[PDB]
RNA sequence: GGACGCCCUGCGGCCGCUCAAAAGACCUGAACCCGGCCGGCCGCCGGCCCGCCGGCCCCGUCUCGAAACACGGACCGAGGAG
RNA sequence: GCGCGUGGGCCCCUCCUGGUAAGCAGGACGGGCGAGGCGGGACGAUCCGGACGCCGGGCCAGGGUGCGCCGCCGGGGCCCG
RNA sequence: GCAGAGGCCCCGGGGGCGAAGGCGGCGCGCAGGCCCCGCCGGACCGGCCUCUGGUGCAGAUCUCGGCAGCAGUAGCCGCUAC
């Protein structure tokens, strides 16, 4: 018998392949992996894992966030691994080159009117496979309503809202009401 | 069912199992009892129908139509299309009211072998399906789509031939067995009106075209990616262990002197 | 599908995932959310603050339409303006013929000031306005007007 | 799921499942209902061919502050409205 | 058994003995209010200042 | 009719794995079922208990699924399937299905002889 | 739906008859179980020419712990429980 | 993040407590059994070694080496198990 | 592995030149199991992909049906008798 239970702490689960039935997402993941194997560019190491992420892990990035993020770097091509969406709140979108997995129709029209080019992952692989003049941007993962309720509400230091309506005095009106 | 009879448990002291028993002492009212209810009776309150979003349903019929125009998918689906001269097949067929007229048009555009594959395939199926009004199974053949033409009477009794109007293209007809790839004989009117039916969807834009596996392969062989590719460091040599002292040649590698 | 369910993978295992020491038994902890202040008190305290008790005034009948208060932030007022009109309005600035938005027609009774408004002077009509709404609109040169 | 953080159900417990008034509506009759209602309309249309199937009904502001601006069909024209067009109720 | 502490220290050391996490050491919980107000006043000036 | 040379085929266990206590009771069939009793001598694999099915008994990947002749097996029901399935392989051999009638098994054998495809059940329905 | 002959005190039997076939009061005809005849002397696992050597407690079950002098189980087929 | 089982334990060491004691009733560091095959202590859920894919060769723990029953002889001392 | 549904099975899947089932013997798979051959049988039956579930039994003093050893055993002992 060998003691393999000491300084060894189990194995971790990391998604090495996209669970997406979509043929397109699998075609890009395999391509970006082939580039990563031949040239270990870290931009491609992240893109390969950003295509394997879940919908919840891959949050939406609006053209308003992208304008703020690319404020000092208009020349650089934003690379988003999710959906680019319009923000009706921003009246004027700046010209920007954005590459995404999907652009909303309202967003796509706005970027083109601005003079920016909406690229696609296949186009990015053809022009800049290693990721030169490109920034890997991400939306806010913990923006989901589900994330806000995670935790034990009713614990003193929890600071989280309860899941149901509840509507009663005990436990809510301060530490003393418990 | 199974709760019509009157059965109550005999109880302890009778040297019998406690299951509910009839006045005779015959076991009753149990899943394991002959003449007994099902443990969980089949119920009509099951949700037989599922729901699909209109966009997703429209996406599936658009993709099935695209698969029809791919020659490889149609042959893979098992249709005989070698004789057919172009995919998609569009024919200026006037109002055909006679099966014999329809057979002649289908012989002259090469669809005859598919019509004969389905005629010679009629068999009595296996299982209790026969008893359930599903006795005969035939292969699926070409799908006629028509607009402003009376082509239905001519092709209706042809075996394996199914007909549809361009306004109500049905997915089950387009993808038999969930497999897309239907040989579709379009009439000139039907094909011409296909771009008008898609406009009639008040607010639907056809999904935007994407790359194929072949396109991805071509990019992976393109000069830009090859220029980025860097050669890897040479691998390590594992070499299975041998006793060094066993031979002088073995000893030399570890100790040259 | 029944065929892809875990229950069909527990055939041959006897207890079926419920335990040899304590098997599946009919309602072991009681029916429903019972025992909330007694044996399940720990769960109600750790996850349900405010389940027990009475909190505030009770309206025997709430008028839902009377308590309907739809609201609009100053950031989205210009989106109500159609895109073709919006670009022209913004470019020309203009006080002689400034754009006029009646948020009540678009379905909103009160204006609020969450974001920022473009410099173009715009007349906004609503049944109520926040303090920030009025300040941000006035600074842009727009007029906060009430609507009958 | 099993307790932990869950929202309490507002589902009322089923009644008269085993016996009593049938409290289960089933909509297998919904496809056939559309055909039957259509057939009734087609027969009525034939009975009074020139006469339209629907009577003229007034435009009414939808009730409440929520629907004030919008208009909808109502039951009938007021006698004052039919005094303006110069008609009579009959 | 009314009470047993056996196995409890094997369970604790199986994946446990965990550090209290960072941001707990530098937490301002229980720090004097007057000091915290002074910190905020000092921070809101020049390079440290984060307002427009 | 002669396959690729191949290597020695080692079967880890010559005899079949039998269910525990299948011998004592007719009701217990010999088909292998995993012992799952609280006090099962076969679950505990005590000394002298019958051997337990394990992946370790698995045959070499190179000689797995290989018939004693040295050719793997392909099930044929019609002449088209022989022509398509046995497309110039020297690894696999044909075996006509039990259902195929004698009349058809002559025309399946003839095409096979022309294609030089070994048929394992050549002497079947022969009269 | 059983020709004829042969027999039987008779019962009934034997030959065969009809049929594609007895399929003969009825399609297929499993297991348990049993009678004839032939072969052995024997449970399971392993080794070998094969009756010797070695190993082997009765499962399911609650249980700290069951071969238990704990409980259920003669046998076999069908039905039988997220 | 979501959940399952569990919440009757028992035993060897070590210090324990009550009791005349107990294969008794309660504590406790660690380990074991539970849920660890296997060889040995004749037998033995826990003891001594050793913790298990399927095999072939070699080494050898613990326990032993008259015969059952695989494997031992040499030397010194005692000598009614 | 089971039972049904939608497809496929290049001249349109396998069948009275013998289907399913049953019985004996191989082979293949670590195994669930599969496959072939012979014999009985006498009309239906699948492989693959997608789909659906009243989908797999050794136990429940399990239900129902057969039926064993006990066993040619216990017994066939009232009212006088032929």
TrEMBL record, chain A:
One of its GO terms (cellular component) is cytosolic large ribosomal subunit. InterPro entries: Ribosomal_eL18 (IPR000039), Ribosomal_eL18/eL18-A/B/_CS (IPR021132), Ribosomal_uL15/eL18 (IPR021131), Ribosomal_uL15/eL18_sf (IPR036227). Residues 158-178 have a biased composition (Basic residues). GO terms for molecular function: RNA binding; structural constituent of ribosome. GO terms for biological process: translation. Residues 1-20, 152-178 are annotated as: Disordered. Gene3D superfamilies: 3.100.10.10. Keywords: Ribonucleoprotein, Ribosomal protein. PANTHER family: 60S RIBOSOMAL PROTEIN L18, LARGE RIBOSOMAL SUBUNIT PROTEIN EL18. Belongs to the eukaryotic ribosomal protein eL18 family. This is Ribosomal protein L18.
UniProtKB/TrEMBL annotation, chain B:
Belongs to the universal ribosomal protein uL4 family. This is Large ribosomal subunit protein uL4. One of its GO terms (molecular function) is RNA binding. The chain holds residues 54 to 310 of 316 of the full protein. The lineage of its organism: Eukaryota, Metamonada, Diplomonadida, Hexamitidae, Giardiinae. It comes from the Eukaryota. Mg(2+) binds at residue 19. GO terms for cellular component: cytosolic large ribosomal subunit. GO terms for biological process: translation. The keyword Transmembrane does not apply. Residues 202-257 form the Large ribosomal subunit protein uL4 C-terminal domain. Keywords: Metal-binding, Ribonucleoprotein, Ribosomal protein.
From TrEMBL, chain E:
It comes from the Eukaryota. Keywords: Metal-binding, Ribonucleoprotein, Ribosomal protein. GO terms for molecular function: structural constituent of ribosome. GO terms for cellular component: cytosolic large ribosomal subunit. Residues 11-22 have a biased composition (Basic residues). One of its GO terms (biological process) is cytoplasmic translation. Mg(2+) binds at residue 16. Residues 1-52 are annotated as: Disordered. Belongs to the eukaryotic ribosomal protein eL29 family. This is 60S ribosomal protein L29. It comes from Giardia intestinalis (strain ATCC 50803 / WB clone C6) (Giardia lamblia).
UniProtKB/TrEMBL annotation, chain F:
One of its GO terms (cellular component) is cytosolic large ribosomal subunit. InterPro entries: Ribosomal_eL32, Ribosomal_eL32_CS, Ribosomal_eL32_sf. SUPFAM superfamilies: Ribosomal protein L32e. GO terms for molecular function: structural constituent of ribosome. One of its GO terms (biological process) is translation. Keywords: Ribonucleoprotein, Ribosomal protein. Belongs to the eukaryotic ribosomal protein eL32 family. This is Ribosomal protein L32. It comes from Giardia intestinalis (strain ATCC 50803 / WB clone C6) (Giardia lamblia). The lineage of its organism: Eukaryota, Metamonada, Diplomonadida, Hexamitidae, Giardiinae.
